[PDB]
Homo-oligomer: 253 residues x 6
């Protein structure tokens, strides 16, 4: 069925999950993206022009795809999380999780009371309009929470955050983290690299898997060796941009 969340389970068994970012915000290219074979695709709702109106068509486009659909909320607040849970998202990427407090809110937003604060609707895409067996009971256990550590504060509290019940994975937002460490546009800086591995280290420390976005293969391969399990190796936008540009160059120079 919809449950159990196989993606959430792969993360638990700390298996390597290869993902790709999506920002093209449309069902046509996203259906093609789902054929690639990635383990998870992040439908970016924060840095990509995506909203409820584009999320649903794309989620339909991904039906029958092995890739686990993950939504990256525009911010960590309960209302949007609620709306995103009902339209059919079972995995979440929460930008800028700086405290254990925030980490809990995020988890609570994906859970029906008393376990959480999720609002209850009786018919929607999540429970496929009432066709999902034992929905209410199951739902609260089949939602993946991926918190992004991309601020100094988030780093300082990485340990508490990773220990939080519900937090299924620790994700590192390199670009934001680099800017946060006074190295905007320079994540490769040894300063950023040390902060990145630290987060990984602590993630592993609390049994939670770590993850990161890294369109550069070398970095991707380095992070995987550092232990990271859910790693995004690129984005539809990026590969499309490079591939097309490259194609033009091999004929025009």
């Amino acid at each position: 069925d919809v449950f159990p969340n196989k993606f959430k389970a792969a993360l638990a068994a700390k298996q390597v999950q290869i993902g790709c970012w999506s920002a093209l915000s449309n069902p046509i290219s996203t259906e093609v993206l789902g054929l690639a074979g990635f383990d998870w695709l992040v439908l970016d709702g924060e840095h990509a022009p995506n909203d409820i109106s584009t999320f649903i068509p794309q989620l339909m486009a991904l039906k029958g795809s092995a890739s686990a659909p993950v939504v990256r909320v525009p911010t960590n607040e309960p209302v949007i999380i609620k709306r995103l849970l009902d339209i059919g998202f079972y995995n979440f990427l929460i930008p800028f999780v700086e405290t254990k407090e925030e980490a809990e809110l995020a988890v609570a937003s994906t859970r029906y009371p008393p376990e959480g604060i999720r609002g209850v609707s009786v018919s929607h895409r999540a429970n496929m309009f009432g066709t999902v067996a034992d929905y209410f009971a199951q739902s609260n256990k089949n939602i993946t929470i991926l918190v992004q550590i991309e601020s100094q504060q988030g780093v300082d509290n990485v340990d508490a955050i990773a220990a939080t019940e519900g937090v299924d994975g620790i994700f590192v937002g390199p670009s934001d983290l680099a800017a946060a460490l006074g190295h905007l546009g320079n994540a490769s800086h040894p300063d950023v690299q040390k902060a990145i591995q630290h987060i990984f280290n602590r993630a592993s420390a609390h049994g939670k898997p770590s993850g990161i976005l890294a369109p550069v293969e070398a970095d991707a391969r380095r992070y995987l060796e550092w232990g990271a399990t859910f790693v995004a190796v690129g984005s539809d936008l990026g590969v499309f941009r490079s591939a097309t540009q490259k194609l033009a160059d091999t004929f025009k120079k």
Copy 2:
């Protein structure tokens, strides 16, 4: 014209208002829905994939319909209420109203200062681009506020909330209330039923009409006898789901 708000008046005279929920989020089916004859249709902006972009087409679809269009905001905050008032909504359903404070904010968001905090625009669907006579003066008296009591806190303060100036009706969100009372997916529980009637009782106590959503006819008929006036007897989604499924079954078993 647009004023006076006849729906707001029916509620005041505590007449029985039979409504239906809408979640299909589109102008085509919603135009058909408007032919049914319901007294009010709730265009759900909280648990249904609806937004400004879908609300307007549907509001146009409902033009010439007896049904009073009611928008169920995604949450109780001034900005979205403001935007929803300008596109042409004169009746509001406010989710999770737990305190008299919140109840006031909600009312204040639908009123131009000093009476409230509503932002002023000079041409929009609300004043039909300047063709509504004495708009500014009238507007502040023709907006229906329906607060949802669906939390324990909301219950505890039902009395204060119902006494609030502006609050035109007390609505009970069964599912959320049930989850709030430790009975997720079991609103029929005598515990929930007692909390429901209590809210009704208090609504009546302060001269304000009470309301509820109940797709099951028996419950609907029971709540009406308990006194509830604005009752939603179903949703486009639900009747569509049952009707279609049923149709398939009478031929395939």
Copy 3:
């Protein structure tokens, strides 16, 4: 997988196929429709505001559904059929098939040279962008063609039409045949019924299953009793319309 076309197979085996019409023209309701369990759903591109931009979302909404998607082209002409083939439709309903040549044209429009005149593209939804095995070869033998006999001339040539290689099923258009016989709005007329019966015998006469649209149950059972195998027992529009009117009535009457 895409191939073989099970719907095409079932028809050939003359087993009863229970379908529903679709005019709501939107992914949200059609996804809910796909849950009903019909053996086939007709995305009407002739009398409903559907087109390529509404078809893809609805086709995606039906992914996973047991229902076989069937598109009713606005008219029998190569170009639109060409385009509809590539967006993912494997089953077609052709309106106003009046002669053997037109029937031929329809079949040809769905097959690659030299079997037919279908245009060639290498990547589209039909072959799921190069993932469907032996696409070219298999596609030509996996397209269901359902012709509509809904006119005087269509009846006169019913035998020639039914004997055409590629015509997988003879469909009767009650409203249009009735009008063709000077009985607009009265399909139940003896003259009309007689023709429907005739088309069915001539269809069975050539070992081709017969079909028709019967929104009224008593008629659906009558036609099935006569031996029609693929019968549409209603439409999402008519069901939604009727069910919402009924719900309103039981409480406002």
Copy 4:
């Protein structure tokens, strides 16, 4: 109500009908347009990016407006007319009507058998999903057909075209007639004016009102002075374009 068609009646009575063209192709501005007070608005499907997906929202936007909606089909052919009839258009403008047969074809395209070849559907916007009384019967006598004489051949056959049963008004296409006479961009040319005058007399000659599009006031008054009854005095596009240019100029010049 839908029937009788008041616009159709007014024309027959040769009373002046003042209209405006629409090319903006969107519900928002067209709703504002519907407030102006024109007796008729032309939703151009020939030279504006309009189509069935933009028509329904705009048709809904015009509900309540005193303006009679008129659709300008992209071309004179049965199928598109069939589809446009069902989405809610009761008035049509046919481009390039050059012969009596074509004029005939147009009328026939809007009438059910045996009067015409219009396809039959039982539920759509035209009959407001089964709510319009005696729809079939009344529809055939309530469709306004406005033919455009904008070509040499159209002028030669103006009398035959005007005498056709069903042709409710003769419309002149200034830009196209001008081009047909070798005067592209110069409709004010004596040769062109002469033909416009001629078409008007031949129209009046058969008791059929005449019409034309005159964005320039002096021309509008001239044509009205000549006796044209349904005159389009401009377009939303031209007005918006001109008014915004003027506003910019008065402050930046």
Copy 5:
């Protein structure tokens, strides 16, 4: 390139910037609007049905237009500002800026740390998917911040707000300010007029240019003489409304 922000520079040199408001929320009319010649066009995201989904098409429509695109956020909060910066907005109008605090938040939301709190994305419309030279460094200096003073509190602190680093212009929202001063719908009241000039006075006092919206020419000309530099002389909606209505009247009276 994209940088340097010429509009931001014109404001600095306190040149007269003639702008127009946009609320029609669509690419078709907005492309025409861009031909008018205004120095800046405010794509209203607060009182007009605009969102990310409509903003992008319109921004593309404005490409190659002299007009500087300005977005009027729905409210002053970092998340939406972030999303609006990535889709391609370089100039912002911030509604209801009442304190120096708020003024700073607004500026900080448009700046990458440490200078601000802007979230970092590597490929988007702002840096044209990586083709803008020295983006990160440049961006933080090429973003225009226009704060709206339209409350009593905002007035009381006009001085502190105008002195804030980042604030590029002081804009007066007449309608809201009037309502704020107990004169809803009467901005011409000497009370409002005195508050307006005060704001202007203080804007100039801190070297920052002042601005205002005034569809009435007299007021527009008066404010310009009072010193205001960035003045919106109308809106697409308003000129469209007046122009169309006027056109109908010159022919029907």
Copy 6:
């Protein structure tokens, strides 16, 4: 400016034009595509889900791009060409041009009387709503017509087709020509290659540049080696598909 048509000029000068196909049907990715640097991009309206509603946004997305936008009409017929001309397309690709008459029809469809049969409108994207100088005059001599020889009959008449006044370039459709020769899926077949070579010589024979679609590099170089000037070296779809599959593979294999 719009005129002269530089792409039309380059072709006439037989200089190499490097293009890419577009089927993604959306403004977001097409804007990124426009950055690649191709001399021309084909917005496919024949084998991709593109149409007037997707074309305008994409056309706007290409404003500023050095790439010349080319539209591939669904089929060679006056009406669709008429409409596509007005929305802003100056370059056309005509599928299945089999005879000299059809080639003629295509050219005529793009020119105003008496040169052709193009319909006349005074304000649209083509003349940028009356801003393009001497539009009527210049437009007729600035429309690029690229005909596709992709059928047996098209090859037989290649010389007559190439000698037609207005035919700016002979394009070969590999997939369709191959099917026409009984080599579906095998364009590399000697029989097919022979015809492609032939069409190229007959094209060069009449001083008309030749073109073709070659997604595989080795073929692109081969055809360019043979002297083809306008060659499409791929499609956004194929590139995106291939690049995303590759990225997934390098980490999951």
